[PDB]
Amino acid sequence: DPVETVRQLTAHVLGLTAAADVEMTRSFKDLGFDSLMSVELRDRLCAALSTTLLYDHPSPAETAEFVRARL
Amino acid sequence: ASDEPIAVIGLSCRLPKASGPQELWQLLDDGASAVTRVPADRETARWGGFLDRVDTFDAGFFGISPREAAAMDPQQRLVLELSWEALEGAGLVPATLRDTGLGVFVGAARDDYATLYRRRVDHHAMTGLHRSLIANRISYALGAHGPSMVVDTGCSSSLVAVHLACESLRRGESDIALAGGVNLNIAAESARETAAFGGLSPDGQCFTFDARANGFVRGEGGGLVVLKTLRRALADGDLVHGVILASAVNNDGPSDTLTTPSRRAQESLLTRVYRRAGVTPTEVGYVELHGTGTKVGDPIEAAALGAVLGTGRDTPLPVGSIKTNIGHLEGAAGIAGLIKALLQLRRRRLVPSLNFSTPNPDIPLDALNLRVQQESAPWATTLVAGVSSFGMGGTNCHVVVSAAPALLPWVVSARSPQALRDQAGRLAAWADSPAGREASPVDIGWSLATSRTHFEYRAVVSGSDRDELVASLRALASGGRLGLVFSGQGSQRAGMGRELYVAFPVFAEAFDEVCGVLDEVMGALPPGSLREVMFEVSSDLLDETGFTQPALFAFEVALYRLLESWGVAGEVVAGHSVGEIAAVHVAGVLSLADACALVAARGRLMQGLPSGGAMVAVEASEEEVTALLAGREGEVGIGAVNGPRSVVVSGGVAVVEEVAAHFAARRLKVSHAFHSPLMDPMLEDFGRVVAGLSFAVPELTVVSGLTGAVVSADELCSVGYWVRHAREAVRFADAVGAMAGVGVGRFVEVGPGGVLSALVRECLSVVAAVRAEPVALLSAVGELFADGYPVDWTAYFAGWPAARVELPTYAFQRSRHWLE
Numbered sequence: 001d002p003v004e005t006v007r008q009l010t011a012h013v014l015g016l017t018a019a020a021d022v023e024m025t026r027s028f029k030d031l032g033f034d035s036l037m038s039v040e041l042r043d044r045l046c047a048a049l050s051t052t053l054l055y056d057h058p059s060p061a062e063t064a065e066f067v068r069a070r071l
Numbered sequence: 072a073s074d075e076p077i078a079v080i081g082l083s084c085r086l087p088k089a090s091g092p093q094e095l096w097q098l099l100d101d102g103a104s105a106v107t108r109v110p111a112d113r114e115t116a117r118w119g120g121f122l123d124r125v126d127t128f129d130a131g132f133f134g135i136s137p138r139e140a141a142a143m144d145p146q147q148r149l150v151l152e153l154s155w156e157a158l159e160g161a162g163l164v165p166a167t168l169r170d171t172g173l174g175v176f177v178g179a180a181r182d183d184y185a186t187l188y189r190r191r192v193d194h195h196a197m198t199g200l201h202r203s204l205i206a207n208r209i210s211y212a213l214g215a216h217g218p219s220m221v222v223d224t225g226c227s228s229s230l231v232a233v234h235l236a237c238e239s240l241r242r243g244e245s246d247i248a249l250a251g252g253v254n255l256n257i258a259a260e261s262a263r264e265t266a267a268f269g270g271l272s273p274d275g276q277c278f279t280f281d282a283r284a285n286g287f288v289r290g291e292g293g294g295l296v297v298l299k300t301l302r303r304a305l306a307d308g309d310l311v312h313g314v315i316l317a318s319a320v321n322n323d324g325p326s327d328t329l330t331t332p333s334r335r336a337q338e339s340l341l342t343r344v345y346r347r348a349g350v351t352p353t354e355v356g357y358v359e360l361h362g363t364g365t366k367v368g369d370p371i372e373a374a375a376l377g378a379v380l381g382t383g384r385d386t387p388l389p390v391g392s393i394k395t396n397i398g399h400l401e402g403a404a405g406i407a408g409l410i411k412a413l414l415q416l417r418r419r420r421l422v423p424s425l426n427f428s429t430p431n432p433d434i435p436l437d438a439l440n441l442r443v444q445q446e447s448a449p450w451a452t453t454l455v456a457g458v459s460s461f462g463m464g465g466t467n468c469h470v471v472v473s474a475a476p477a478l479l480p481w482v483v484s485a486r487s488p489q490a491l492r493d494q495a496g497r498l499a500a501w502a503d504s505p506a507g508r509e510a511s512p513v514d515i516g517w518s519l520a521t522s523r524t525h526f527e528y529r530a531v532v533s534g535s536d537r538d539e540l541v542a543s544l545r546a547l548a549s550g551g552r553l554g555l556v557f558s559g560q561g562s563q564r565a566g567m568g569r570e571l572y573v574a575f576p577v578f579a580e581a582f583d584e585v586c587g588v589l590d591e592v593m594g595a596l597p598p599g600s601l602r603e604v605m606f607e608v609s610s611d612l613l614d615e616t617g618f619t620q621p622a623l624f625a626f627e628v629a630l631y632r633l634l635e636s637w638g639v640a641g642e643v644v645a646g647h648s649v650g651e652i653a654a655v656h657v658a659g660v661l662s663l664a665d666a667c668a669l670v671a672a673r674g675r676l677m678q679g680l681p682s683g684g685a686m687v688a689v690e691a692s693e694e695e696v697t698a699l700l701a702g703r704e705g706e707v708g709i710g711a712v713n714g715p716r717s718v719v720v721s722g723g724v725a726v727v728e729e730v731a732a733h734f735a736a737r738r739l740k741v742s743h744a745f746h747s748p749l750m751d752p753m754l755e756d757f758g759r760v761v762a763g764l765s766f767a768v769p770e771l772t773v774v775s776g777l778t779g780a781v782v783s784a785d786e787l788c789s790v791g792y793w794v795r796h797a798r799e800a801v802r803f804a805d806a807v808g809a810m811a812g813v814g815v816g817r818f819v820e821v822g823p824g825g826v827l828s829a830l831v832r833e834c835l836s837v838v839a840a841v842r843a844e845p846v847a848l849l850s851a852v853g854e855l856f857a858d859g860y861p862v863d864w865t866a867y868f869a870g871w872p873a874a875r876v877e878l879p880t881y882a883f884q885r886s887r888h889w890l891e
């Protein structure tokens with residue numbers, strides 16, 4: 001869950017259709033993430049937990065590390 | 072300085088709540104905010120800095136049909152208005168820039184009118200909606216051959232434009248340049264797009280460098296600056312409003328986000344431009360910020376400035392932003408900032424940057440060494456200012472500017488009589504205003520003469536000080552060949568030429584030469600100062616023909632000399648009786664000596680005749696009086712044919728009475744029956760005087776009062792002509808007809824009274840020149856000038872050390888033009 005849900009959301013903001021089309025190993029700026037598009041992840045991520053999360057982790061996978069880590 | 076410093080010699084603008092530089096200084100110095108809610112007549116984020124209205128435009132001034140104006144971008148219209156205003160403020164006459172290398176550089180990045188047009192087609196839409204024409208149109212109306220272009224770098228456009236103008240001047244591609252920009256927020260779709268970008272302040276204010284900074288508020292307007300090289304400007308003697316020492320443009324390059332500004336690029340830009348100008352951080356007295364009030368942008372700009380101009384400086388660098396007053400004009404942001412700086416340089420004062428109370432915690436004002444101007448303080452040390460403008464694509468631009476190194480006539484013109492009314496009213500209100508009282512009435516008259524185009528509807532007001540001239544303007548607010556008719560006997564009055572002598576030294580000099588020569592001639596052969604007889608109101612000596620002919624000759628010759636110095640050079644001349652003597656002299660036929668001898672001999676030989684002569688003005692055709700007097704040739708005859716139904720009968724005072732009674736007819740106050748058989752006794756004596764004078768070929772076209780037609784030199788230079796002129800009838804009506812025939816369209820009465828002018832009007836533009844004679848002659852030249860004649864008003868102010876001063880611009884006859 002902490003992985004495929006990122007594959008199914010980072011595209012919802014990026015606009016890619018296939019969930020697997022996310023090169024989840026490449027930098028966010030290299031994937032093409034804007035200010036609004038970066039923070040749209042943070043504002044839809046806690047939609048169903050708790051600022052600069054996605055500049056702290058410039059990689060979809062390396063941000064997805066932060067799900068089950070501390071529970 | 073590295074490169075040629077560029078002089079700013081004039082500017083114009085339209086800004087929210089500021090129709091011009093005056094109003095702009097008013098708004099800025101008062102620390103007033105022009106930001107308001109969206110006016111009802113607009114469409115819809117709900118705040119902005121808006122002009123009063125954008126639909127008005129004088130389409131007739133610029134030769135634009137209402138059809139073309141309606142499909143025309145209001146940005147194109149406004150830039151037209153701003154171009155004319157900027158040139159006039161620079162002091163230049165636009166006619167003179169025709170076919171020159173004038174360059175036009177305009178920054179624009181929004182096409183709201185075109186969007187409106189397309190969301191709802193004729194051949195004008197192509198030109199009216201295309202952006203390139205914002206500059207190109209100007210080049211076509213002024214006739215400029217210099218480069219004409221529109222540049223879009225985003226919000227930084229207008230400033231870049233000035234840069235490009237500067238470089239174009241330094242290379243010689245253009246000799247004068249107009250530089251600036253325009254942005255008009257008339258469409259809700261652009262507002263929605265910039266709003267969806269999130270850059271917009273929800274409170275509708277630009278909290279530049281303030282901790283409240285949450286975005287910018289939109290603004291609209293436009294602005295122009297006239298630019299010359301410092302060399303060329305100083306050489307031409309222009310009003311320098313500032314000097315650009317250096318300018319540069321770069322791009323952010325590898326920013327974090329496409330829209331995130333770069334500190335390093337901004338620092339590189341600052342370093343480059345100030346090294347090129349050779350200005351250290353201490354020499355900078357102020358920096359006009361981009362200052363949009365954005366959470367991201369403000370810290371970056373502040374940090375760049377503190378890195379380049381903060382370190383190596385004792386006192387805090389004052390900074391501010393006009394976006395706090397009128398908002399973010401985007402495409403036209405840059406120019407606005409510049410104009411602000413310019414007004415601070417000329418005024419040598421600072422104005423508050425509004426919306427500031429607490430420093431942004433992201434901005435260490437103390438460490439960075441910068442302070443926000445909050446007080447309308449003065450400016451101490453010359454003064455140097457710097458302007459920044461940054462585009463969302465990263466194209467940044469900075470510019471370094473430095474500060475600069477009896478009876479009066481006022482002339483106004485306009486393209487419409489109602490426009491003339493408004494021009495006069497505007498000039499009057501300005502003359503009363505403080506800004507106009509800082510200029511003297513002499514300088515004002517000079518600048519009106521030299522720095523304004525003379526449109527087809529003109530007028531001239533006279534006064535001794537400011538108040539007289541002002542009230543004159545208030546009252547105002549409520550062709551062909553030139554022909555001169557010289558007045559004859561009966562137009563004389565006591566006090567001739569006394570007051571012409573005291574105002575204008577030219578009349579005094581010519582009148583003294585003629586009066587000295589005439590004093591000599593009449594002192595040898597008296598009928599001893601003609602000056603005294605003419606100037607004395609308590610003197611009827613002028614009604615005797617021994618004085619009236621020399622008096623008229625002196626008055627008219629000095630009057631012609633003064634009209635000629637004012638440029639008014641007649642092409643066809645004519646004269647009633649003694650009037651001819653002046654006309655033939657000023658034609659160059661007779662020298663001053665021979666002319667004075669002729670006229671004094673005529674007057675004296677006519678004065679020694681016995682009484683019993685009389686002349687009566689009669690409302691009768693020449694045919695009628697020919698019927699009435701035939702058979703009485705030895706006793707009475709036609710003195711003059713002044714009109715189709717106006718003739719003067721001259722003869723024995725006995726025979727004159729029954730003519731008057733038959734037609735009863737105004738009795739003329741004359742001493743003798745001129746142009747009648749009673750003039751035979753003095754004919755032959757006169758015939759010897761004329762036989763001893765030198766007659767030359769005239770320099771102008773002469774029309775004879777004896778012949779009634781154009782007289783040739785062989786005829787005009789014979790003794791018989793002048794004796795017949797002294798004997799026979801003055802055919803003045805036929806002379807007016809002949810002058811009209813050769814091509815005269817403008818008739819001038821040289822002399823006192825308005826008699827000959829009434830006669831010329833009867834025969835048919837008729838102006839009676841003269842008759843306080845300072846007033847009475849400034850009136851003559853004003854009526855000439857407004858009739859179409861090119862009067863060299865410049866040469867009038869050669870006596871005073873007048874200088875060029877800024878003046879209010881043309882009052883445009885604005886009407887609405889829009890779509891539906």
Ligand SMILES: *CC(=O)NCCNC(=O)CCNC(=O)[C@H](O)C(C)(C)COP(*)(=O)O
Nearest residue numbers: 035226270328330331363365367368462463
């Ligand atoms: C055209 C224009 O807006 N020009 C200068 C005024 N704008 C700015 O200073 C924008 C600075 N940056 C931002 O406002 C933010 O970067 C954005 C653009 C709102 C997006 O944020 P994200 O890039 O972090």
